[PDB]
Amino acid sequence: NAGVTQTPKFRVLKTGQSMTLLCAQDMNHEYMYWYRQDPGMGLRLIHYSVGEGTTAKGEVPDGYNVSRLKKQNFLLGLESAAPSQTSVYFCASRYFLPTQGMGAFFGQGTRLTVVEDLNKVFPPEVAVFEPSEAEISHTQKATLVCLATGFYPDHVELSWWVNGKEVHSGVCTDPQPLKEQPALNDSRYALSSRLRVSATFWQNPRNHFRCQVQFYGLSENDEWTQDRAKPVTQIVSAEAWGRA
């Protein structure tokens, strides 16, 4: 199935650093757009393009450049990263002669955080909390809780794995991470999730439960001069085993 795709999906940049975002579509669409969306806000047009080799300014073009190298690709450039550029970026496309009454097809988003001190970047600490015996006795059900804490930036994806297979049934994860210290602009974040199974399934000592948190942090190219382990893109997990 044909759609709009964006690369990369996540990026952490130090102030003054550069990056390129790439948008691609194989729908033969003439119109391509680059938008930014701030938390709990609307999409603002940065730059757009009516066809190959031509571009035009949107509502918020300052600090960004674009190239429409060919019909399929639309590149967004940041020459000197600024904290105000911390946002979620969305590419969009549509035909010159519309099929969906002015509506456009959108990409899935690129999360960018521009940090002032790479020493503030921290991976999550992950812990699993075992089911309550009273819950088991009262409902014949067992809820495990996963907490991912102290991470910065908020670039995380949490998943549950039962006996080595990812599960979706009985899973509930917070839609967004929360700020641990709301009064601080660069506060570290926390995320919670629940996995609910039958009490009998929790009671099988051969059942294995793992909460996993994919974190997007620093890259191999980034410098690191601290005593603690470099906070690279990584998976952090915690685990539990069934109890008879």
């Binding site: 709009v4 119109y31 757009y33 709990g40 806000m41 609307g42 999409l43 603002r44 047009l45 757009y48 009516v50 035009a56 949107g58 969305f90 549509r94 010159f96 969906q100 009454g101 002015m102 509506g103 456009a104 097809f105 959108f106 990409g107 899935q108 988003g109 812990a127 909390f129 075992e130 089911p131 309550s132 009273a134 819950e135 009262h138 409902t139 059900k141 809820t143 809780v145 907490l147 049934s169 009985g170 899973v171 509930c172 994860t173 917070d174 839609p175 967004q176 929360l178 641990e180 926390a190 919670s192 629940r194 996995l195 609910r196 039958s198």
Partner: protein, 196 residues
Amino acid sequence: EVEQDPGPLSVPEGAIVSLNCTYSNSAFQYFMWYRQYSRKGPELLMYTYSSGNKEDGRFTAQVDKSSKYISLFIRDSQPSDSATYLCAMSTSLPNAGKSTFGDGTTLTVKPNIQNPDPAVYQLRDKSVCLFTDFDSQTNVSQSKDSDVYITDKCVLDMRSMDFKSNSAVAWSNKSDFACANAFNNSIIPEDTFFPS
């Protein structure tokens, strides 16, 4: 300039929902509604040209150019309708393919709970308290304490069992934090079970 209903909007399953936007540009002629799921791209849901209504299943898009007021109505709201709704508007042609977006309204459609059994459980170990099995009518409030973290009600679905359940998680490393006081800032059901 598009002025969209700020929200957040929280409704029980089966309720009629009204999502609205006002605008100041008289030349606006194309009116779009996008649906955006948590951490996904916006997706075109409804679109209309000029004044009037358009009906599509449980959805009605309406435009009143006279009073510069547009609305999206969702009949018999369902938990899967939970998303951010954004209105977008374009001026009459030429418009160079450009559209102006409203700031969005985040909608949560609370699922109906068939057999509620409200309770607060202490999980095994930085202590964790789980408030679960309460119906859609319960509002989970934040703690009055800065060191106590609370995450709003979440609905998990145990498919093979045909069972759904609400849950809020409370945690703290603080000295006198206990599950009997964890949700004191919330109005919880009178029959909430507090086991030993």
